[PDB]
Amino acid sequence: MSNSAIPLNVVAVQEPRLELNNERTWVVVKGGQQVTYYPFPSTSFSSNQFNFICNPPSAQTVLDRLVFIQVPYDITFTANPSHAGITENLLQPGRDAFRAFPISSITNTLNATINGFPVNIELAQIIHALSRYHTPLKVKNGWMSMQPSFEDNYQSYRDADGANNNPLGVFTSAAGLSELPRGSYTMNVVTNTTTTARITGVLYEQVFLPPFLWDGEQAGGLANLTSLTFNWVLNNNLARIWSHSDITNDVSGNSTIGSMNISFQQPSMYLGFVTPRLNIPIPPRITYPYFKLSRYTTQFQNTLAPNASSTFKSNVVQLDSIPRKLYLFVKQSDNVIYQNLNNQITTPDVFLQINNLNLTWNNQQGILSGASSQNLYDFSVQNGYNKTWSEFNGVTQQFNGVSGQPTKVIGLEGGIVCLELGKDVGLRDDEAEGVIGNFNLQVQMTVTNTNQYVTVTPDMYIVAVYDGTLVISNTSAMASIGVASKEEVLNARITHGVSYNELQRIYG
Amino acid sequence: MSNSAIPLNVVAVQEPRLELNNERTWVVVKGGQQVTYYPFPSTSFSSNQFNFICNPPSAQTVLDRLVFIQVPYDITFTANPSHAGITENLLQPGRDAFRAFPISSITNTLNATINGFPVNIELAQIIHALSRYHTPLKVKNGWMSMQPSFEDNYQSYRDADGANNNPLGVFTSAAGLSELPRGSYTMNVVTNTTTTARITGVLYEQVFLPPFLWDGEQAGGLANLTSLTFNWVLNNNLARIWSHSDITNDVSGNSTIGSMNISFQQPSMYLGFVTPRLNIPIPPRITYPYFKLSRYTTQFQNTLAPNASSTFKSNVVQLDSIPRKLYLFVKQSDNVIYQNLNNQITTPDVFLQINNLNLTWNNQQGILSGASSQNLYDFSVQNGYNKTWSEFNGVTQQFNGVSGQPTKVIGLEGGIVCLELGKDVGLRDDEAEGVIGNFNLQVQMTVTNTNQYVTVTPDMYIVAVYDGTLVISNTSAMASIGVASKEEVLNARITHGVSYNELQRIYG
Amino acid sequence: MSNSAIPLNVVAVQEPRLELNNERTWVVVKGGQQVTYYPFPSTSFSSNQFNFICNPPSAQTVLDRLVFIQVPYDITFTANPSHAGITENLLQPGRDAFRAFPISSITNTLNATINGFPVNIELAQIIHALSRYHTPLKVKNGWMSMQPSFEDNYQSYRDADGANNNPLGVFTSAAGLSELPRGSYTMNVVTNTTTTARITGVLYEQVFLPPFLWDGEQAGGLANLTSLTFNWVLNNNLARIWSHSDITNDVSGNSTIGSMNISFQQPSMYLGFVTPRLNIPIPPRITYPYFKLSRYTTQFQNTLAPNASSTFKSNVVQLDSIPRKLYLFVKQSDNVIYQNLNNQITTPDVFLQINNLNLTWNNQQGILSGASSQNLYDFSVQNGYNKTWSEFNGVTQQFNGVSGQPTKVIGLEGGIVCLELGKDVGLRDDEAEGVIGNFNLQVQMTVTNTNQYVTVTPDMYIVAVYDGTLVISNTSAMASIGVASKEEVLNARITHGVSYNELQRIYG
Amino acid sequence: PNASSTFKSNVVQLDSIPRKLYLFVKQSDNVIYQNLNNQITTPDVFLQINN
Amino acid sequence: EPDTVYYDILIPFKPNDQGFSPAIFQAQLTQPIVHNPSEYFLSVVRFSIPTQ
Amino acid sequence: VATGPWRLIDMFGSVPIYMVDLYVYWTDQTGGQYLINIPPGRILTCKLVFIKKSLSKY
Structure with a gap:
């Protein structure tokens, strides 16, 4: 119906410029009134780990799935004996910036517990791989924008410099509308000179793990819960955050930056709680x-x-x-x-x-x-x-x-x-x-x-x-x-109905 | 499937590589018959206003929704007799190019009346914010590209120069398959020298007010129109077309350009009228x-x-x-x-x-x-x-x-x-x-x-x-x-059928 | 809602962050056991034309649509009289690469018969028309990444250098997460000076002609094939693989390079056979x-x-x-x-x-x-x-x-x-x-x-x-x-059922 | 004088199946006609059908 | 909804750093003048221009 | 100053009005626009009127 070894039936479809008659329906979108954000400061924070604890406003209040934690810091560097002289400012223009995703990679392991049941993943080894996998241009240049995010494509920082495409450089050199190099990120600076440097700033990082998502789309917020808590148990080294380049340092494996000491201030984590509308109910x-x-x-x-x-x-x-x-x-x-x-x-x-x-x-x-x-x-x-x-x-x-x-x-x-x-x-x-x-x-x-x-x-x-x-x-x-x-x-029973390229979209 | 808390319902879904059998149907696409493009030259052109007035050619002629206007121009730059010299040509290599998007920015307001009911937008201030999103790279590179299309990244022009990302840079030095800069736009330079510059070309600008659309998605056209007509009133200043670098000033500073003059010639709207085929009828x-x-x-x-x-x-x-x-x-x-x-x-x-x-x-x-x-x-x-x-x-x-x-x-x-x-x-x-x-x-x-x-x-x-x-x-x-x-x-009554993404699509 | 000139019908949707209820399912994803791969080497390649033949295992094994052919090669250039000049290394960093796409550009025609009915595509010039057309950035940067596949954008190489979007440059110098230029594709240089040069490597190119596909998504792979034989036939000229810039050659129209020859070692082609599950069978x-x-x-x-x-x-x-x-x-x-x-x-x-x-x-x-x-x-x-x-x-x-x-x-x-x-x-x-x-x-x-x-x-x-x-x-x-x-x-009979755009995809 | 090529026969609607039909490429006529010597010199023969 | 509503348009004075004023005024009004203008004939009294 | 009788222009769609936009121009032959300019010492003043169509016309 007609003409193939097997007749296959027909349907005609109207060109995009001309429908023009089809059931047009006015559609209204409805979500619960008042979604409000609270900042929880963190009591019980140290250089050895961060501790959060949060009561919901109550039960009956759907908690949105995106979460993140903003943390203020204080790092000082000091010059190394004795490769010296180490003429010129301790920190270089294109040479040296933050590693990415700084606070994630430093975290030795991360644990959260929804409402009594513990759900934790390890961050330090997992993330640098799982990073690559489900991001185009829009999705990587969106939520994941907040922490530094440019990958380490070069096999050593020695060869990079000075490249237009270099992994860690100033925002000035980039291609309009594409991911920025890690160097762009603000690092408000107190002072620097050969023999020293001091930087201070605030950095954001999103919780990685399930369910809470770091991807573009979004889905239904967890409910209904009574307790939530996060534990970052930091790694014991803590120097890993910052990244350096070998070109600057020669030649006995003696390097400018050794040694230094990082400090944190009190971190706070932000999460927002939508409340559904009384009339249409959510199940128990x-x-x-x-x-x-x-x-x-x-x-x-x-x-x-x-x-x-x-x-x-x-x-x-x-x-x-x-x-x-x-x-x-x-x-x-x-x-x-x-x-x-x-x-x-x-x-x-x-x-x-x-x-x-x-x-x-x-x-x-x-x-x-x-x-x-x-x-x-x-x-x-x-x-x-x-x-x-x-x-x-x-x-x-x-x-x-x-x-x-x-x-x-x-x-x-x-x-x-x-x-x-x-x-x-x-x-x-x-x-x-x-x-x-x-x-x-x-x-x-x-x-x-x-x-x-x-x-x-x-x-x-x-x-x-x-x-x-x-x-x-x-x-x-x-x-x-x-x-x-x-x-x-x-x-x-198998379904011709749902498409498979939809399951790509699920996660994550 | 079953055996978790509440028992779930089950479907199997085929892989991609093999379905292989599903009920396939040949589809015929049918939009007809004659598709055209007209150039209504603006009646009554001036430095103060362009006015177009153009009625659809025939009965029940649907009208496509991408509309635009081309306008041939002429400009001359003159040097300001202070700070001199003043060495080097007035127009510079990676220093000066069109403001994006030019015509729209210098439009105080544009009006159009579909079929005797008036619809107008405020092009001047609305734009630079409405332009920032919802744009993706795909779309930016498409329809939009005709008018100078790149944004203003830096807080001030002086610093910018010269970046691999610099807003007003010549086409070379823009990274492959990515938004090119505003120096690319091709128009002839008649004479460039100290004390004098003069240039001519032809700029396509999109009509930006819905219903008409500028995002690359396609949706029905407005039959059954009798008379469309537009009206452009130009913003008084007219210098605002040009951009500059604060740098070239320099040090006084009275900017080297001492002035400008901008002139126009007849510019033409460009509408497309499809007409539907006899068999399929459009509702009254x-x-x-x-x-x-x-x-x-x-x-x-x-x-x-x-x-x-x-x-x-x-x-x-x-x-x-x-x-x-x-x-x-x-x-x-x-x-x-x-x-x-x-x-x-x-x-x-x-x-x-x-x-x-x-x-x-x-x-x-x-x-x-x-x-x-x-x-x-x-x-x-x-x-x-x-x-x-x-x-x-x-x-x-x-x-x-x-x-x-x-x-x-x-x-x-x-x-x-x-x-x-x-x-x-x-x-x-x-x-x-x-x-x-x-x-x-x-x-x-x-x-x-x-x-x-x-x-x-x-x-x-x-x-x-x-x-x-x-x-x-x-x-x-x-x-x-x-x-x-x-x-x-x-x-x-709610539906599980459609979902918030599809809703996202309609605009635009 | 029935507030419009003609009454329209209403529905409700829920905002993404809360359904929170609708029927969920669990979707198990069934794919036949035993996916395999194999390099079929060319039965009787040559310098003039080469050609492979392979038979799928049986009637029930579904071959997949994405096929490609990798081919190892060597070359050698030698500086001619009487241009020199004759200075610097015969290859230079910014000036040399393969044509996008290298073996595609040389094929006079690629013929591939399926199951006994021969379908063929001429390829020397038909390939460049199809090349610019349907790909977007995210799909350009996927499968089509194996052949040196960046499109020539200037009207002559001579002018290109040195723009950081120059069509044949070195990897560094190409912006971050972008389409990387032609020069970047690796093969080793055994020697290089004036008067001589010699390179060796292995270039992939995926066989283009439909049915076999080059765009990311999967459609059911041909089965139940009985036998399949490709065979290429190349242009005698062959010199077209390499491309070279103009600047370096001296005036008097004299050219640094001429002349040189190519070599191929037996090449191969990778097919992917999948075989279905016990209970689900494929239609006759x-x-x-x-x-x-x-x-x-x-x-x-x-x-x-x-x-x-x-x-x-x-x-x-x-x-x-x-x-x-x-x-x-x-x-x-x-x-x-x-x-x-x-x-x-x-x-x-x-x-x-x-x-x-x-x-x-x-x-x-x-x-x-x-x-x-x-x-x-x-x-x-x-x-x-x-x-x-x-x-x-x-x-x-x-x-x-x-x-x-x-x-x-x-x-x-x-x-x-x-x-x-x-x-x-x-x-x-x-x-x-x-x-x-x-x-x-x-x-x-x-x-x-x-x-x-x-x-x-x-x-x-x-x-x-x-x-x-x-x-x-x-x-x-x-x-x-x-x-x-x-x-x-x-x-x-016309269905207001299927969209246009989904229709757009299964190109083409 | 011995390079190969392909050709598209032009379309043609018939009313009734022909009992048989003969296709053959050949040297195009116009050339054969212009100029007396050329006109006498060249034979009847066709080009070999590769497929 | 009332039978008739008057409105007053006046433009003050604005010089550039370079002494010049555009005699145009434009303004978004913080609250609608006519509830629905399908049933109004608009006309103007009393307009006046400095021609100095 | 208007001296009578009311001279009417029309109005069309059903959008509540949100903007008063007005431009003044003075023209010379050969007919070029030249947007008018207001001297240091004076203020430029129009007035307006809406009438309900129903009172004026059946």
Whole structure:
């Protein structure tokens, strides 16, 4: 109906300039009266951790989902014996700014508890990876704008300078309407001169974790609850906040900035509470979506540099149930970085390029045996990786014309691969994205160091984000992962109705 | 599915790679038949006003909604016989170009009457705020691009030069696939020299008042019109077309340009008329969504400089129905910046930073008294803002790395907050966005001057946008505000069907 | 609500921050077990033409639509007599890269037969029309990131350097989160001096022709294929891969580079086979959308330069079915630019600017004859054009500020008009986008040349693209255009059901 | 004098199926006609159909 | 709603730094003059201009 | 000063009025605009009237 091997029926559609007759309905939008914000100062704050505690106005008052905490500080630097002279102002024009997202990356682990049930994620290792994944231009240049946010694309700050695209530079040099370099951020300054510096300012950072969201869209605020609290348990180093550049410092690994001491003032956290309208009521027990992402790591002692190739194996682990997604990536030297003030300050968070990877699920191994390192970037940008292929697996040929200077290769950030489990890995039928229980997974993979100067000693993380329901009812809040059972997954009526590219939009 | 708290309902959804079977249907698109474009040259052109008058060619001829006007011009610049010399050509390389958007900015007001019912907007002050959002990069690069299109980032022109981001820069040096700068706009320079400059070209400006539209989305056209007609009254000053750098002055300073002259020639409207096909009939009376922009402004005497804060209460105004959205921002006083043109020519377009705002609506006071300005930004970046937080709260410290100097601050741009009404004010029970009749509000709001040289006398603005449904028949031109009634807004049956995003789309 | 001229119907919505109640579901996401990948190496490549063949495992395994072919290579340039000059490294940092996109630009035609019915696309010139057209930033920066794919925006390289948006620069120098320029793509340099140079690497390019897709979303991948064989055939000239800037070459028209040769090592191509679950089976016979590009080209004897206008006549044609889309870009001719390499390597990929076009579809003339160039741009952007008005119709007044040189004009890019026949031309009643009959077009049009540097002989174009349905069943490949009858098309039950825009996406 | 190309046959509506039909490219006539020598010299033959 | 309402338009005096005044006035009025202007004939009495 | 009889202009749509906008110009042949200018010592004054259509016309 007509003319294909199989006749397929018709419908005609009117051009955009001409409807012009269709049921036009006047639609009114209604949300509860009075949404009001309260600032809670924080009693019981220290350099070792921050403590918040907040009673809602009551119950019956839907608490909005976006949250953030504004914190005032005080940092002083001092000059280093004895690389000196260190002529010229201690802090440089393009050279040195805040790391991003400063207070998040410093936080050793973060815990919050909705209404009795504790829900916490780790911030320090998780964030620099999960950062990349679900942001275009608009979404990254929006809420995530408040804390510094420009990634560390260059393999060392040594090579960057002086580049138009440099990771951390003054707002003056940027391309109109795009993400600013970290340097733009205000750092009200008390004084600086060779041998010292003092800066003071206020910085905002949004809570990261579930449910509360750091993304563009927004959904239904948690209710109905009695108690909430946040604990930032800071990391013990605290020097990591600030980031430096090696070009300035030569040449015994003796660096200008060592040493220094940060201080905080009393921080406050802002959250707003909408109250619904009396007439249309909200039910006594509401059920939300609930995600939680537990990382797994491994320590290796086999050293490779400056650009030698090697292979690894993860070690076995036993995930409780299929996880919604899985981010695998090698990243340098977690133990190694911390010793030395010098190390904490002047090194970026890029990860080495995956030459190739193989993986084993439960009961099959050699999943993705011969998928080109490149084929792994083809998925995902399907799951929104949000970088160029070039920079993924990034090595950079840049030639110099004079006779004779050898052209130089340039370090770059490496791939962080991901795979949602239904989509790529493939699954024994009767197994879906939620269902409990037991499975075991080991990753093997070959990575190659790409930066020039420092020999890296690897360790590789494997974050896994589970899926699950959480019901918040006034007395107590409960959650299941494995909300689905086996017999129900098999033979679940399939729907041509809802689109799949909608599930991209859910989170996050 | 089942087995969590309350038992849930279950659907399975196919992957992307394979559906594979779903009920596919061939669709035929049909808009016809003849599509055209006419050029009604403006009757009666002048330096004071352009006037167009143009009736649709034929019966039942629908009329497309993107309208614009091209206007060939001529300008000459003359040197001011002080500060001389005065070496180097009057027009500079990355120093001087058109103000964006030019014609609209120098329009005191434009009028159009669809079918004998009059509709007018106030182009001069409304624009630079209405332009800031809801713009995305996609759209900015599209329809908008024809008229000079880039914003004013820096608080003052002097500092800007020369940046990789500098507002008035030549096309080269604008980063690939991103908003280009105002020096790009191609027009011939007849002669450029010391003491004399003269230039000619042809500028396309969009007609900016709804119903007509400037965002790239397409919606029905207004059949069945009998006679459209526009009217442009030019703002008296006419120097305001040009921009400048405070730098080139220099040191006295009487700006090197001593004057200007601007001339025009006939310019032509450009409308498109589609006509529908015989088979499908258009109904004799149709209805459209028509919005309404008005501005209520206030004067002041006490000034701040260069970085002092203060408070201003607005002026009690009355509005005939609950507005859809509402804008509120401070600005450098129009009264001044008009005498002594050179300031007028080199003065930029940016808004003082809103430290906090507190608004008393009908039967309330102090609404959003406790929202940290930071808070005032998150909503709405949601509504559309598209500028980065750093721009909001204008300031950035850029150090200079040489002993011994003071580091220096820059100011970028003010916040230009807005509150969608049912969303961020909280609308009292049994009442909704549409409802008539009268209300009234006045916003008392503290602010600061952040521009580092000039003493800024302020003013306040408040751009309201009403929602109305107007019917065009032949011949009639009914228009209504407050179409909903009190009883209808109580117990209007809700839908899970549509969602707040789709609502977001309609405007615009 | 029933307050309007004609009563309208009401509904309510809830503001995003509170539903808080509506039915929730749990959506498990089922995808067949055992996704695999494999590099199929070329059975009998060569230097002239290379070609792969692969057979899907069986009747039930669904191959995926995104295919690409990676090819390793080496090159070698050698400095000629008698230009020198002959100074500095034969390659220079800002001046050299691959053409976007490198192996696409060389292919004479790519043929790929599916299941026994051969569909092919010519690719040398058809690829650049399609290149600018449908992509936006976020999708440009995804899959299409593997080939060096930044569009040539100046009318000659000579002027480009050094702008921080120059089409072939080094990675640093390209702004943050943007489209990075051509030079950035890595391959190692084994040597470089005067008198010689030699590079080695591996360039990806994803095979372009539909069905296989290059835009991010996934549609069901071809199954149930029985066999599939690609094969390319390349232009003998081959020198086109490399592109080089003008400045470096010395006056007397002498060129640094000439001449050089290329080499290829056996190349491969990566297919992705997926196989469905136990219980969900794929229908015996299925039906995919089937597009079909064509190219018609007309060259003349007359020449224009360095910026004089001309008008021209395209040859008459007869068209079997109204096509969906058409592209009408006139570009510097192919007759020249395969003769004498330095010019052949050097020439950019821009076309002449369109002062206006006059078109005649059947039995009517004068279509679009009064529509100013500016109008064309708007409809083209609406179709997705994506480039700013400034470059379309490109020229730019970049002005000098030195006493007393004249002020350089730049030739910029090109314009490429596109029309959709239902959207833009309007088809007589009883006729629509798919229907068959014999409708002759002949597109007269006037054009100016803009680059200041060379005389140009111009060959016009018209790419058309029909929309059909092709059914695959193993092993069969019926395909039919216009499915699609005059009476059925006229009757046309019309659904106010589907939007236009969603329809827009499954291009094209 | 031996480079390949493609060609689009022009459209043509018939009333009744033809029993058979013959397609063949050939050297275009006008050229053969202009100028006496040219006119005598060149034969009848066609170009080889690649597909 | 009442049968008839008068309005007064006067422009004061505003010089530039460079001595010149635009004889135009424009003003957003803080509260509507006519409730609904479909049923008014507008006309003007008593207008006066300095021609000095 | 008006001396009679009332000379009427019309009014059209149903928007409550929010703006008084007024421009004064003096013209010379050849007919160019020249927006009028107010001297240091004087004030420029119009008046206005709305009448309800129903009283004036049936």
